[PDB]
């Protein structure tokens, strides 16, 4: 099951989260139903409580990439949204529209000018498929801020227990994520 004690940090300036693009420097997957390791980057934007984000995954083992577009509504709680998502090709052509069974809930635990910490619960129907914490930065392999490192320790986690993506030979598609 996804981790239970997850609520958005109150007082967060949303302009810092919905900013630039994010690259995942570190991830923590509690119970990886696969052993393949991924890199990821995404570009979150918000307008009138609606979030839209182009999302990229790179499978570091197979060296393949897949693409999605998430769309969700901000909760009344703060920087937290449940997104449904399209599946697209690298040109953003829709392969599958969003549906009412598949979603993810993203919760911003910290965000500052250079870095973020977010939690993501991926669900399909009645099932939590996967729980992830991800440390984010605005450029590939940038060092996460002290503030975000402190947020990891505040979340009850050890940053050392995360998988660091730098060693994975990540490839990104910065054209896909632009816009």
17 vs 38, which CB is nearer to ligand HEM? Answer: 38
Nearest to 122 by CA among 34, 13, 59: 34
Does 138 show up as a binding residue in the annotation?
A: no
The residue behind tokens 């994010």 is 22
Nearest to 102 by CA among 72, 135, 136, 132: 72
Least distance in angstroms from the C-beta of 102 to ligand HEM: 6
Summarize as ranges the residues that interact with ligand HEM (CB under 6 A).
24, 27, 34, 38-40, 42, 55, 57, 68, 85, 87, 104, 106, 120, 122, 132, 134, 165
Cα 57 from chain centroid? 10
Concatenating the DSSP letter of every residue in 91-147 gives: T--EEE---SSEEEEEEEEEE-SSEEEEEEEEEETTEEEEEEEEEEESSTTPPPPHH
18 vs 85, which CB is nearer to ligand HEM? Answer: 85
85 vs 176, which CB is nearer to ligand HEM? Answer: 85
59 vs 149, which CB is nearer to ligand HEM? Answer: 59
Least distance in angstroms from the C-beta of 70 to ligand HEM: 6
Contact in structure between 149 and 119 (CB atoms under 8 Å): no
Least distance in angstroms from the C-beta of 46 to ligand HEM: 13
List, as residue ranges, the binding site for heme.
57
List, as residue ranges, the binding site.
57
């Amino acid at each position: 099951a996804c981790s239970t004690n997850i609520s958005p940090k109150q007082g967060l300036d949303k302009a810092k989260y919905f900013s630039g693009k994010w690259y995942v420097t570190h991830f923590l997957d509690k119970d990886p139903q696969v052993t393949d390791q991924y890199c990821s980057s995404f570009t979150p934007r918000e307008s009138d409580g609606t979030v839209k984000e182009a999302l990229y995954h790179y499978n570091a083992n197979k060296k393949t990439s897949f693409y999605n577009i998430g769309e969700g509504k901000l909760e009344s709680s703060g920087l937290q949204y449940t997104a449904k998502y399209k599946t697209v090709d690298k040109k953003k052509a829709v392969l599958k529209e969003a549906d009412e069974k598949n979603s993810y809930t993203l919760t911003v635990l910290e965000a500052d000018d250079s870095s973020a910490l977010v939690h993501i619960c991926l669900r399909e129907g009645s099932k939590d498929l996967g729980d992830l914490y991800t440390v984010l930065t605005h450029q590939k392999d940038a060092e996460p801020s002290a503030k975000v490192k402190s947020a990891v320790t505040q979340a009850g986690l050890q940053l050392s227990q995360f998988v660091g993506t730098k060693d994975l030979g990540c490839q990104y598609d910065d054209q896909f994520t632009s816009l």
